[PDB]
Amino acid sequence: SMLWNNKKDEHGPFDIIGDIHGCYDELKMLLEKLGYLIEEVEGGVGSGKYRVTHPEGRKVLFLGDLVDRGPKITEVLKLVMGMVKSGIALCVPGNHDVKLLRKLNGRDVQITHGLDRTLEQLAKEPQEFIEEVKAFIDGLVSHYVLDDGKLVVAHAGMKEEFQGRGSGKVREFALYGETTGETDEYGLPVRYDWASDYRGKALVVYGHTPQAEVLKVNNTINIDTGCVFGGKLTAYRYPEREIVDVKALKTYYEPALEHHH
Ligand SMILES: [Mn+2]
């Protein structure tokens, strides 16, 4: 009964933040707008470079996809790692984060979707920081069930049946979701729209495929508003159920191509 995903004793309030993808400036703006105070620490290095506090004792929940695409990936990492360490944040992993971990561990993965930017930015940092990043990503839990089971956070979402489960299949769902088993017009796999079929008790806040505006469906909401693509970085305030966002300062990266159909 003792899984890592159980944080039911954590009641918040929480500010839940979608995919950052290296957008440090917007992250800093959003945290400040939420009332967090960010101190650039004197002499501070790596995960000790920053210290974040909140006078109302609010906590941040990051939905992952911290790395790739954007201009300030190592600063995002330093900030988020420090927050998790000081206890003001938790983080669940995105697909990009885990793929980065596999690459740093020695797997010869495809350099795509912004990973080149992470690698070239990481290259400018010392080695002990690189090991800190590996340790950080390796310890990320697939999802968290929080606040007496009233809230679930996961990167790609978490359908009811899998909530609170620690199996390998549940971790894959958190990272990637699942496919429907059938193919599309190109004979390719199709993503399963789990949120449409969701009837679970917990509100699920997640950040899967990027959207122009938050996508609320049944007791679920996707808050990846595509900051790095020139959209915005969104926080969802819990239990207030309020949306707070910061517009991207620039278009840092081009979004996926779109089929005509
Ligand atoms: Mn993403």
d(CA 181, CA 231): 32
Ligand 1 centre and the CA of 65: distance in Å?
Answer: 5
Strands 143-146 and 89-91: unpaired
28 contact partners, CB below 8 Å, separation of at least 6: 38, 79
Residue with tokens 């009332």: 35
Which residues partner with 244 through β-bridges? 235
Which residue positions form the known binding site?
A: 19, 21, 65
Ligand 1 centre and the CA of 39: distance in Å?
Answer: 27
Ligand 1 centre and the CA of 113: distance in Å?
Answer: 9
Ligand 1 centre and the CA of 208: distance in Å?
Answer: 7
Q: What is the SS3 assignment for 97? A: helix
Residue with tokens 């979004």: 255
Closest CA to 200 of 164, 176, 236, 174: 164
Ligand 1 centre and the CA of 196: distance in Å?
Answer: 21
Residues with CB under 5 A from ligand 1 (ion): 19, 65
d(CA 112, CA 152): 30
Q: Which domains does the chain have, with CATH numbers?
A: 1-261 (3.60.21.10)
Cited resolution, angstroms = 1.6
130-133's contacts with Cβ under 8 Å and 24+ in sequence apart are 130/104, 132/46, 132/47, 132/81, 133/77, 133/81, 133/100, 133/104
